[PDB]
Design a protein around this nucleic acid. Sequence first.
DNA 1: GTCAGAGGTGGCGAAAC
DNA 2: TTTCGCCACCTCTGAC
Length: 49
Amino acid sequence: LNELKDRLDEMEGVQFKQFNSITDYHAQMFDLGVIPKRLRSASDRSKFY
DNA sequence: GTCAGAGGTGGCGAAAC
DNA sequence: TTTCGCCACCTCTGAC
């Protein structure tokens, strides 16, 4: 990961992000149109699964 | 009436105490 | 454990 981040940061225009929680991850996914539903709660995530 | 602004609320995560 | 901040959306009221 750390070497990967170094490799990416040296490039131009690419954005790298690391998530400390799955929720933030899910949020970015939803915002980008990757998921149909916004998985705010645990229960939601359960449903999806 | 719709959309934007404004604010609030709520959730989750982070940090500190 | 609380607080704080951030983020997102929804609610509420103004403006177009």
